[PDB]
Design a protein around this ligand. Structure first.
Ligand SMILES: C[S@@+](CC[C@H](N)C(=O)[O-])C[C@H]1O[C@@H](n2cnc3c(N)ncnc32)[C@H](O)[C@@H]1O
Lengths: 32, 262, 224, 128
């Protein structure tokens, strides 16, 4: 889900941490 | 456009709060004439009230007409007068600490604040003269009376700003204090009105609330305490009392009225 | 599954875009670019219960040769709230010899605030009320036990000989009819009124946020 | 006599404000207030990162966080800062290496020049 990232009140670093965590979990499912 | 400015649009409660007439029947009210309220024993004339409005006027300038914290000290308030009730008293700037000290001395406790943000009927007129230069040739008294108001979209220029040694006086604070009781329970209606409402005044007389503002205060008290209102069971057992009442707007349905040297 | 693969391509594009944004922001930061904070602001980031006020008193007596003239306060009332008595335990008496204090009190902590500032050695002389406003210019809203709460009050105590210069009489107004913002933010009209009361002067303000910084104020805070 | 508030503010910031709020002599640090509280990336943190690349490998910022920064450092942000201190958008060709300080500045200048002559220098990083 991109909605948590999609928020404007967040800064560019916590957003990027969220994008990397999304990559980690979806690459875990890709490995699955 | 008419009916959309800030002055014309913060003041429609005036349209929705027409005052009533005087009560002709004697059984509806109770009027007491006293020579010295602070020296009076009100228990012989009233008992177990729940709303004690005090229309006290302070001087705080030595050479002026009014009462004092000494007069409030001399005033006697007992358990048989109020055991579970709320007192409404007009507060001021310098003597707020003395008011709360003398009233928490007699078992009361501060609960809530209810103030009137003052507006000027003459400063709005002079602002209309400044922003206009064939209808703004009137008196501010007639401006208050006929509800004909000048259009203002920035009210924070017509605030009544009376002289002071500090920030200019621009509000009238009514202190509300509740005497709790462990045995009985006071029945209240919660959040039926706001704690702040704007009202028009005059520059020369900023401490004299209009008829509609006084009725707004009275209906605030009556809506807060419904069981104190006039009914068939309150005949001779009125649960709202007045101190330092006046002939201007006081005698009401179910109100005990105590005058001062009529 | 290829929907999450398309999401992966989109998330790569989003990562590249935010990478560029972060690099641009940190390149402009490491360049000529100033924040909204004035250059003359003095921020102190320390817990008030752990802050040594003797060092502050010595620094103010050294670098100004005087003491503070206005002390603004927005206490964390317990109704990160700290306490009710720990605010009273503040060494305010040492921080001023002649001036004002501005304590913003909620309706539940009104009388205790009055007692606190009377115990500090001040005398109640005025109160400043903030009436909230809407976009269209209404009285906003409220909720309480007896009345709908659409106000907020600041209590002012006085000290020493304020009539001996540095202060002006008959200025500003008690009521601030300003629209609410943030969560607990107060308007800047109180700062304008303070500057009207005390032109120039030395100020201290004990519970501050990063929006509380001004070009003449010493500001204390836990995150500021 | 009236006093100037610039020198007074600098003197007060010298002895009262933290090292993260005031710069050098007495000036205000604006990067501190351009960033939300807790993510400032102090120059001590930057030097700790440079020492981490100097000592251990590049791209292995787990033991670097564990026993070099504080025991608690922002991963992903470490990758971002290592990208920014090499002038290149990616560290793919620098994984597993231990670049020294002089080699770090040399490769930073080389990447800056290489993006300059091919027109890829967009905020001193190279996009590849
Ligand atoms: C009490 S409100 C003050 C907010 C302020 N009135 C404004 O304009 O937003 C929250 C503030 O209290 C501060 N605070 C809470 N506990 C504190 C403490 N023990 N010492 C110092 N600051 C404290 C918080 O860090 C935050 O800055």
């Amino acid at each position: 889900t991109l909605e948590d990232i999609e928020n404007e009140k967040f800064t560019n670093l916590e957003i990027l941490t969220h994008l990397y965590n999304l990559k980690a979990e979806i690459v875990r499912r890709l490995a699955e | 456009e008419p009916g959309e400015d800030q002055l014309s649009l913060l003041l429609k409660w005036r349209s929705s709060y027409i005052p009533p007439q005087k009560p002709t029947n004697e059984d509806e009210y109770k009027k007491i004439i006293c020579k010295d309220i602070s020296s009076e024993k009100l228990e012989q004339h009233a008992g177990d009230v729940s709303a004690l409005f005090i229309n006290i006027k302070w001087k705080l300038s030595e050479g002026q007409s009014g009462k004092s914290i000494e007069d409030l000290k001399k005033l006697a308030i007992s358990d048989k007068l109020i055991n579970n009730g709320i007192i409404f008293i007009w507060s001021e700037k310098e003597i707020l600490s003395q008011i709360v000290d003398v009233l928490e001395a007699k078992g009361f406790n501060y609960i809530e604040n209810f103030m009137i943000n003052q507006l000027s009927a003459d400063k709005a007129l002079e602002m209309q003269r400044k922003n206009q230069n064939i209808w703004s040739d009137i008196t501010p008294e007639q401006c208050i009376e006929q509800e004909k108001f000048p259009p203002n979209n920035y009210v924070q220029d017509i605030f009544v700003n009376s002289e002071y040694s500090f920030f200019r006086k621009s509000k009238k604070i009514l202190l509300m204090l509740r005497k709790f009781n462990k045995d009985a329970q006071l029945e209240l209606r919660h959040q039926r009105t706001s704690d702040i409402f704007f009202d028009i005044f005059e520059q020369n007389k900023p401490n004299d609330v209009s008829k509609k503002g006084m009725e707004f205060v009275y209906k605030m008290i009556e809506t807060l305490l419904p069981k104190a209102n006039y009914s068939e069971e309150n005949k001779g057992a009125f649960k709202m009392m007045e101190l330092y009442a006046d002939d201007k707007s006081q005698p009401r349905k179910g109100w005990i009225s105590v005058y001062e040297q009529e | 599954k290829k929907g999450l693969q398309g999401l992966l391509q989109d998330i790569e594009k989003r990562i590249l875009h935010y990478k560029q944004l972060f690099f641009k922001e940190q390149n402009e930061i490491a360049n000529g670019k100033r924040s909204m904070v004035p250059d003359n602001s003095i921020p102190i980031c320390s817990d008030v219960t752990k802050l040594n006020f003797q060092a502050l008193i010595d620094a103010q007596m050294r670098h100004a040769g005087k003491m503070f003239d206005v002390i603004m306060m927005d206490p964390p009332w317990q109704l990160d709230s700290l306490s009710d008595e720990k605010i009273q335990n503040m060494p305010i008496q040492s921080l001023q010899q002649d001036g004002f204090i501005f304590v913003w009190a909620i309706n539940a902590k009104y009388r205790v605030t009055i007692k606190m500032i009377e115990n500090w050695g001040y005398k109640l002389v005025d109160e400043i009320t903030w009436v909230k406003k809407t976009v269209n210019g209404k009285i906003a809203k409220g909720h309480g036990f007896y009345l709908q709460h659409a106000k907020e009050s600041c209590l002012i105590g006085v000290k020493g000989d304020v009539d001996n210069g540095r202060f002006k009489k008959n200025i500003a107004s008690d009521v601030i009819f300003s629209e609410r913002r943030g969560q607990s933010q107060k308007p800047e009209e109180i700062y304008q009124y303070i500057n009207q009361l005390c032109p120039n002067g030395n100020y201290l303000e004990i519970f501050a946020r990063r929006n509380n910084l001004h070009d003449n104020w010493v500001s204390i805070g836990n995150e500021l | 006599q009236p006093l100037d508030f610039t020198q007074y503010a600098k003197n007060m910031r010298k002895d009262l404000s933290n090292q993260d709020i005031c710069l050098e002599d007495g000036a205000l640090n604006h990067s501190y207030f351009l960033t939300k509280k807790g993510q400032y990336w102090t120059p001590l943190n930057q030097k700790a990162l440079q020492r981490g690349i100097e000592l251990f490998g590049v791209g292995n910022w787990k033991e670097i966080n564990y026993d070099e920064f504080s025991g608690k450092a922002n991963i992903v942000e470490l990758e971002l800062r290592t990208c920014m201190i090499l002038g290149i958008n990616d560290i793919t060709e620098y994984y597993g290496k231990k670049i020294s300080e002089e080699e770090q500045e040399e490769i930073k200048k080389s990447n800056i020049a290489k993006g300059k002559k091919e027109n890829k220098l967009k905020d001193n990083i190279y996009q590849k």
